[PDB]
């Protein structure tokens with residue numbers, strides 16, 4: 001029940017929530033719980049896309065972004081259980097890391 005915490009930064013439209021099969025178009029910035037940024041689609045000036053229902057992203061995103069409506073900006077705090085677990089992500093994220101993502105849901109495709 002606490003694998004991902006979603007805290008609203010600015011609201012969306014309150015009606016359009018992503019469904020399985022839909023593609024979410026987002027800008028994000030990921031950091032360790034300490035605060036050290038490890039990636040951001042904003043640094044590439046190009047939104048990230050992922051389709052729900054396909055195991056395309058860590059579980060904290062799959063459940064976390066589905067709680068967001070189009071336009072919403074939110075802070076997602078994801079336990080290692082819902083992220084990279086005991087293994088981490090090769091050369092990026094250590095074992096048992098708590099992650100924090102600033103996510104803006106731009107549109108659905």
Ligand SMILES: C=C1CCN2C(=O)COc3cccc(c3)[C@@H](CCc3ccc(OC)c(OC)c3)OC(=O)[C@@H]3CCCCN3C(=O)C(=O)C(C)(C)COC(=O)[C@H](C)NC(=O)[C@H]2C1
Nearest residue numbers: 028030038039044048055056057058059061083084089092
């Ligand atoms: C210019 C580019 C560099 C090369 N390039 C990629 O190499 C694509 O890399 C990914 C794409 C989609 C999802 C993934 C990783 C997955 C990782 C693989 C995966 C998939 C599913 C899992 O379960 C079912 C899982 O369970 C363990 C693991 O990333 C995630 O889910 C979460 C949530 C979505 C945002 C990224 N995410 C992170 O953590 C991070 O910020 C990373 C990966 C450290 C850094 O991301 C990036 O640079 C972004 C994405 N790269 C790109 O935009 C393209 C273009």
